[PDB]
Amino acid sequence: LSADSIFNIVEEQTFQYFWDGAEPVSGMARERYHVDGNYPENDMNVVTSGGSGFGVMALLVGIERGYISREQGLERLMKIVSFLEKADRFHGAWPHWLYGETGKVKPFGQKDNGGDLVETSFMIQGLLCVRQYFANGNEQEKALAARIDQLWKAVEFSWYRNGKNVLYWHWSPNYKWQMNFPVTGYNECLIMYILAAASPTHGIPAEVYHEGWAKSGAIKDSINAYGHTLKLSHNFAKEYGGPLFWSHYSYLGLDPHGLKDRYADYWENNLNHVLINREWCIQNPKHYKGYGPDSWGLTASYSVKGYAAHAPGENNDLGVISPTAALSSMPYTPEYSKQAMVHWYNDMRTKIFGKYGFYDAFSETENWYPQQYLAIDQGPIVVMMENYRSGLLWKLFMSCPEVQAGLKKLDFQSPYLKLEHHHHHH
């Protein structure tokens, strides 16, 4: 099959993770789906707040593409929003995990039993797109958009500062600030600070971003690999950059085209991140089976021994290729991402393509082809493939007046920003 046909099959099948594969009570994205029905942790109906952020965006793609009808999409998104309104919130932030059937927190580790502002941010990036999509619809659609607007305005980003010039990832009603994870760059979390600056009700002053996230300029670096330079200081990953998903999550709604601030050119950094990851796979210094220009992309995913933050480098490449890395990079390296897609589909689909698209990860070296999926890995595939085609989520997210105001407050530039004209003196 041709690239154009395979693209459509891949996008549609991966979408179904979030439709057929959804938890049925909540309509939210499952943390995981195991095709054999075996869940070691009896956790099949635990839903991911961040992955469901990606999933609401995927629902919009399905409406646009005709994978579902507008009425299907609306009923589902109403079910999701109903769930989220009733679900456990901690100063406005959802927890990392909820039980789909009850809306109560499932602790992600003992002390992580309250708000998770980063996964909440991923949710909000997706809900804001839904809000923009339905804002001029019928009355029930407009009502939905308003219900989302209320959830948005209730997220208390300001609370998560704990009075400092940074944002904490967590807060618990009983463990208070003991998780103690101040979010400092560069990693996958940029969108949290953009949304915090954007909030009209519980926003942050800009120093929270420049001192906290950007470390008063120490986020700037220069990591050279294979002739490509990264100018952001990738946390713990200063040779090759982090797992490739860091160039995905915060860029599903926030368009990285022409996105720039005093710390970086985000298009160039994200694209260089991909290019370095791909070239590592091509050079294949560890001599793993099947690595090449037709099978590349290392990121966090299921792994031979459990789950690992795969990335370029001696210690991080475990011979595991995770299709979300190359596929979600579609906007940055479309012919290179398609190259892998086409080889995987035409040559490997018996082993690695299933009812919700490509499985999470595989190792040709270890003959390991798990029939397993994660929301956080399927969601960016649907979203970024669609953004490459149509810019659908980008156009929706970048159209939010609050997003534009947040970006201006943080001194970002973007071609989406409407610049105000001033005469010379007044």
Ligand X SMILES: OC[C@H]1O[C@H](O[C@H]2O[C@H](CO)[C@@H](O)[C@H](O)[C@H]2O)[C@H](O)[C@@H](O)[C@@H]1O
Residues that bind ligand X (CB under 6 A): 420-423, 426
Residue 305 or 423 having the CB closest to ligand X: 423
Q: Which is nearer to ligand X, 4 or 420 (CB)?
A: 420
Q: Considering the complex, what minimum distance in angstroms separates the CB of residue 405 from ligand X?
A: 14
CB 107 within 8 A of CB 379: no
- Structure token pair of residue 52: 């469901």
Q: Which is nearer to ligand X, 305 or 426 (CB)?
A: 426
Taking the complex as a whole, how short is the minimal distance between the CB of residue 425 and ligand X, in angstroms? Answer: 8
Give least dist CB 406 to ligand X, A.
19
Give the torsion sign (CA, 34, 28, 61, 406): negative
Does residue 198 contact residue 151 with C-beta atoms inside 8 Å?
no
Q: How far is the CB of 385 from ligand X (least distance, A)?
A: 37
Q: What is the DSSP string of 101-166?
A: TT--EE-SSTT--SEEHHHHHHHHHHHHHHHHHHTTS-HHHHHHHHHHHHHHHH--GGGGGTTSSS
The single-letter DSSP state of residue 216 is: G
Give the three-state DSSP class for 270. Answer: helix
- Closest distance to ligand X from the beta carbon of 416 (Å): 16
Contact 308, 363 (CB under 8 A): no
287 or 425: CB nearest ligand X:
425
Q: How many CB atoms lie within 10 A of CB 10?
A: 25
- The smaller minimum CB distance to ligand X, of residues 287 and 426, is found at 426
CB closer to ligand X, 314 vs 420: 420
In angstroms, what is the minimal distance from the CB of 372 to ligand X? 53
Cα→Cα distances 330→1, 158, 248, 390, Å: 19, 35, 10, 12
CB of 262 to ligand X, least distance (A): 24
Residues 23 and 47: their CA atoms lie apart, in Å, by 7
Indicate the residue among 305 and 422 with the shorter CB distance to ligand X: 422
Of residues 287 and 421, the one with the C-beta less far from ligand X: 421
Residue 408 beta carbon to ligand X: minimum distance, rounded to whole angstroms: 13
For residue 420, the minimal CB distance to ligand X (Å) is: 4
Report in angstroms how near the CB of residue 423 gets to ligand X at its nearest.
3
Longest dimension (CA), the chain: 70
Neighbours of 78 (CB within 10 A): 16
> CA-based Rg of the chain, rounded to a whole angstrom?
20
Q: Which is nearer to ligand X, 34 or 409 (CB)?
A: 409
> For residues 339 and 409, what is the distance between their CA atoms, to the nearest angstrom?
40
Rounded to an integer, what distance in angstroms lies between the CA atom of residue 366 and that of residue 357?
22
Please give the C-alpha separations between residue 403 and each of 86, 124, 196, 251, 415, in angstroms, as whole numbers: 26, 11, 10, 13, 13
Q: Give every CB contact of residue 407 below 8 A, 6+ residues apart in sequence.
A: 194, 197, 198, 414, 417
In the chain, what is the straight-line distance between the N-terminal and C-terminal CA atoms, in Å?
62
Tokens 């707040």 sit on residue: 49
Nearer to ligand X, 287 or 422 (CB): 422
